[PDB]
Amino acid sequence: FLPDHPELKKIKAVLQEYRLQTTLQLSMKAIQHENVDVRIHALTSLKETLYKNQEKLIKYATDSETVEPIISQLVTVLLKGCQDANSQARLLCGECLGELGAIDPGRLDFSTTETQGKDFTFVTGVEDSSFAYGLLMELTRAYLAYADNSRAQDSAAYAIQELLSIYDCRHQLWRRFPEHVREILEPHLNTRYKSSQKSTDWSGVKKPIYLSKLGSNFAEWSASWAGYLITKVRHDLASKIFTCCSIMMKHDFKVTIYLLPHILVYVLLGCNQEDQQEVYAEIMAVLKHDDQHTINTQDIASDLCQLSTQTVFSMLDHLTQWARHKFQALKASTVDYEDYQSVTRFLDLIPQDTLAVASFRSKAYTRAVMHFESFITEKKQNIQEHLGFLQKLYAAMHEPDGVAGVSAIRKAEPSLKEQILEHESLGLLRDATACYDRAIQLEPDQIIHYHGVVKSMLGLGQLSTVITQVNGVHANRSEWTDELNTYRVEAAWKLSQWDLVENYLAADGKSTTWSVRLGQLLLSAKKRDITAFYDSLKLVRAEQIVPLSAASFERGSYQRGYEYIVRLHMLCELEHSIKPLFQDSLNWVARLEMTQNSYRAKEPILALRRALLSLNKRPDYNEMVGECWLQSARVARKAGHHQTAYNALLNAGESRLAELYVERAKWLWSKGDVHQALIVLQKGVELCFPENETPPEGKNMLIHGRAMLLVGRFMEETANFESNAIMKKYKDVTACLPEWEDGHFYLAKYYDKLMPMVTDNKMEKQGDLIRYIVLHFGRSLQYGNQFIYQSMPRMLTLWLDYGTKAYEWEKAGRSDRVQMRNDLGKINKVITEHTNYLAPYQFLTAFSQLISRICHSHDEVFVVLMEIIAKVFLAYPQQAMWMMTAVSKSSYPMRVNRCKEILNKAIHMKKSLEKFVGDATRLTDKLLELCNKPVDGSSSTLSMSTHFKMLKKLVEEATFSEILIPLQSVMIPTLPSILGTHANHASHEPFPGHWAYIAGFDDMVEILASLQKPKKISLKGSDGKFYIMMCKPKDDLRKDCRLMEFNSLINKCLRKDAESRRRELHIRTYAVIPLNDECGIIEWVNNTAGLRPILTKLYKEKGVYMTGKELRQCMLPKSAALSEKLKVFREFLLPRHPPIFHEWFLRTFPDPTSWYSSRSAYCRSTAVMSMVGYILGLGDRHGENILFDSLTGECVHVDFNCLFNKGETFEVPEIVPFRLTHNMVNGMGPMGTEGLFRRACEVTMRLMRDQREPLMSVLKTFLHDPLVEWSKPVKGHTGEVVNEKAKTHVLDIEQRLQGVIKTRNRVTGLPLSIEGHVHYLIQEATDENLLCQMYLGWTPYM
Amino acid sequence: EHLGFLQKLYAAMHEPDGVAGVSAIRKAEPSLKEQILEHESLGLRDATACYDRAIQLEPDQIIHYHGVVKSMLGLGQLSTVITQVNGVHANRSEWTDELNTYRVEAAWKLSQWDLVENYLAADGKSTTWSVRLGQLLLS
Amino acid sequence: SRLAELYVERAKWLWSKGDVHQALIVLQKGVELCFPENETPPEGKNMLIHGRAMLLVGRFMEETANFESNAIMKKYKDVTACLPEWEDGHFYLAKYYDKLMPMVTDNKMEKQGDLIRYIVLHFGRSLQYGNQFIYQSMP
């Protein structure tokens, strides 16, 4: 009902008698409602609400890295609604989004959009009840659909009767159909019907049905071809059904659509060679014909070409699915084999290349790519001649990486047009401009070249030149002037030359360009035209929504359509800026900040805002325009395009801004001319902040602080400057903005860098320095959590290490002990103050490390540590308990005693925690028992009740406390965003989301042969969902746990970065929880299977398979020379296993769109994981350890025990960076490594290099972790262990991040590589010499 | 106080070092004109955008269009130069006479002889090196 | 008609920018595009361009850290073979041998001997064919 008014308040008193986030959920549920008017009211109310609660909404969006979950759900819902049929609803929902803002897909989270689609219900045959049922539903919806012809509804009910003839509903058949269909079909289900139409013979008329009078119209062509076919099929039941539905077919084409596929299947089963040739003729004709290619009266044809293409495609698709299912049957008789053979033969008759060309004609890009790769492989056809078509395709799809790959592959020199394609897809547009000029010289009669020239000009921002260029072109040719008018319009309105806008607009009444529409709106604003304004507003909103409509029906849709979403954002902002003029609550700053960080996103919004400000007449507009030009800088500077803001860095101009200087400095710094930047910056500082008068006020003090900090950083970079001056500058920055975090942070970093040098690397001397360091770090934290990941861990490491060294010196008998002791006391006091000031979650973030050092030797240090950990525990008992469990049950007694001390202190602080602690202890003990429960016999499945009674009971008791199901989402804390820093540090919610407590266990427990017989359990969550948790004996997971943490941090990074996001790079992460050193519980990842098993099944299906003994024969002695091994490999192992993985892709995903999306995801995921592994030195990537999700196609890695180049230590050393066997490559597609995969690798590598500091700090903490079983277990168990290769491991990790291979022999001085790094890595992985050496277990041949 | 004058001088002397030094000395922010001068003295890409902003600031000045056309020349964008001069002419007939030299140079470089002849015919007052070269080549 | 020349000058420009790797790839592709091993390039100027390209690839390799010493050495030797009388080949080969010697010999001249003989001989021949690097070579 969703009333919103006092009358609605009467209804609400009613609802109270019956019984912002709340209202939001309500409106959400509303919009989903079926009644269109219901939804419309919902949407209107929602739009108003959003406008009214804009403040709280923005706060939700920007307070924390990730948006409030409710927001994510709401945006998913709105984008869905975009798909709705009613135009009004679509427009309303577009307004919804635009009002929300253009949230960076990163900040949003889409797990709801599983989008299975309820599709792929391939029907094996007509006989199948479900298929005949769908046919009956078709006919019923048909007869009801139209009353225009009594004969037609009569034909549908007649087919109902004939279906009763084929099979009686009276009771499975009746059971099959629903009641809204049941009651509709019942009146004629039994009555009777005369033949709806007079008999006609499609076979009598002989002609290619396409291009025939009957085939003139699409539906009529559907009617003539299907009738002919029905005549053709030699199937009595098929003939019966076909005749039954014939009459209905004449009236509605859609019934024809449903029927044709199986009609063809039956025609294939019962075949005449001449009939087969005629069928292939019809299909080829439909495919061969290009509506633009052939000339005829197009009233029928225009629609006919497209529709017929789609129909033939669908028919072939059903044929393919039928053939695959029949091959599965055959493997699982002879008549079915013959039928399947006939169908496969007909399929073969069709040309893949033809299919691809047609598809491309029909804009069915994805299917085109699929067909084209299928062609390039199925029939081997060389490297070099089809590249043009494939490149054009990728261009269409807008997949840049496709174009880049295609280029990377082409051997022959690239044609000019191809270089144009490449520069457009990805290029600085400078080469683009010059190539355009050269094209104009090469071709003087093509408009598109001038298009590109003008577009480039605009990009650089040379408006006036663009206007004049358009005018010139106009002078040369009048006709082109119409097409080119758009860019002139854009320049004008951005130029703020309204009159020119009016002229050019009046000139053309045929341009639908976004730019032209924007100019129209701005004009209607300039000259107050309320009615026209709002009309154009509706129109443009609809237009924009159009593309997003199709975009919605896809995974990751939001991202794919983000451009249009930003357009809607601009529209909303424009509306709210204009309204007051006609007769502006929105907060522009926050809005902009929510947007993704890339040109495509920010720039257009900013230009539009400059325009609006121009239309607005406010005194401060002159300066606001400077802020907008300066806001364009740091939105482009970050991207590159350094000339793309000359008309910005200059444009800013008048508005007084030391900010102008700071910006010019950052720019120079990006460009590499550091000394320049320092000069310009010192000058701007002197000028804007003369020493005589202090800047004490607001933005002035702020900018002064920022400038001083930047000066300091520059000075650090330059080698000339003295340490002391740097330290002084940083201290000054701190003094001028004590509240700022960056100040203290950089100060601490610099002191840290200096300390090793000043102290000679002697801890004793370092003490005082360490105090200063930790103090400033903690302060920085207290202000903001931007650099938390680098700050916290470093501080903790330093303090704890100093404590350890002091304990050693006290035990030693060395004089420095007393000074060290006083220093340590001071340090501990500092830590205490930090504890008091810092919020709990901030410690939570390194809680892992904290726990790691629980066994520290010095008691005072331990007291402090315990205070910290206890504060945390109280703050977040669930996560803390999970993380501490293992240590609790450690075999080492000291670990257990200390953890118990901690828990006791906590309990003392908050009693209620005691009950929960006891419950958790009991639950963990029982789970450990289970994990270690010995299986008897095969015992594939064991009932919970039969064996694990105590567990079911314990969970059953109502007294038992709720235990949060361990899940990565609930373990990895989120953090407050920089934008919002007020009271966020105090009230920040670490784990905003849905918390599922353990409500019970499904009875059945699975035991898996592989993985050393690990039990698999399924917990039952409070929400009712079931989560499957594998229980693993004999594995130390601590390593895996911390690695998962690091992966989560990497995932955050990947999400924030534009380039990674657009590709949707992400590392699949599964929660891991160690019950104790030997046993831990690991979350299951469903729909996923190992590469080895999958390919093994494929091979067996192909009949080609290698026996284990065969392999043993192929195996050779390790001492054998490399030549013999390479031989064995190439000669036998590679031959035996041909590349088939692409087939797995094909079968798993039938639909072209799903196929393409999943293939892309596969490439991206494998790339990301390979890079990450090579950085972390992941090893043992053997078939089973790597996995692929059947649902998305992504790749997931497991068995992260082998880390930090432990593989080399193996008897058979691992000599490859990551697992890239020929099969995986084949998977990626014909392009192979080159293409998507390469670009993903490169992007991931770049990102990692950028965040090198935070990752490196975290990894440091990880490597020096004492709890981790770095070595073999000794005696079964100070409860501390030290990793001997720690320093070496950190050095190697750093180098790899640096990009310094250091492998080079005979010369150890090597400049870092950049992309050549990814290239050399790929080469190494691919090389056969290496692989052949690799151990058989890795199954390199596969 | 007098830095503008010294910069102008060094510009006249064709002494780039002078202008660079001036710029380095100035405390105040550089005006757009002085910026144009410095760009021109010390070698073109940045100067094109500066010229664009200039034109936007003052439309009537012809020197700015001169600079933009020259730049487009240096980069090798002949065709663009032709179209640009043509557009300017469309807007202002007068300017066409001063700008004809660039068009002629472009053409002659394009090898488009008809355009060379026609443009050279347009006006008979240019003595620019480029214009004489075009006359010779056409002959 | 100047494919080889094209790719070579291009590699040079690219290097100028700094993307050494993108240079090496394009250059190797060109080496395959023209003078493609199917038959030995003896065609005079063609042989010259072939040698120039080979030497360029060799110096590139030297720049990149991945490539092994032996391969670089072999490439320089190939350039030497291709053009016996071209100084550049000999000079660069000598330079690379010099740089390698200290590590190979562990900085023990005794072992350094034979390498020294090779190096000196190649310097000398380089001098016979030209005088571009005399100041580096002779001393």
Ligand SMILES: CNCc1ccc(-c2cc(-c3nc(-c4ccc(S(=O)(=O)C(C)C)cc4)cnc3N)on2)cc1
């Ligand atoms: C018109 N006369 C001047 C001229 C013009 C072009 C050339 C030329 C052509 C090639 C060439 N480039 C590639 C290549 C390039 C880029 C990428 S990329 O991934 O960065 C992404 C940007 C695509 C990947 C591969 C592959 N094969 C090739 N044959 O190299 N130089 C030489 C002279």
Ligand SMILES: CNCc1ccc(-c2cc(-c3nc(-c4ccc(S(=O)(=O)C(C)C)cc4)cnc3N)on2)cc1
């Ligand atoms: C209207 N346009 C917007 C706008 C306005 C002003 C600024 C601005 C002003 C200054 C500034 N520069 C210098 C300086 C010194 C030496 C050279 S140099 O020739 O040696 C070099 C080519 C190597 C160049 C410049 C000296 N004092 C200064 N105050 O820096 N940025 C930036 C954008």
Ligand SMILES: CNCc1ccc(-c2cc(-c3nc(-c4ccc(S(=O)(=O)C(C)C)cc4)cnc3N)on2)cc1
């Ligand atoms: C020395 N360290 C020992 C060690 C060993 C294993 C792990 C481990 C395992 C998983 C994990 N595996 C799967 C999984 C695995 C295989 C297949 S399979 O079809 O190929 C067929 C072979 C069953 C299907 C699914 C799903 N979800 C998961 N979380 O995670 N960690 C960790 C440490």
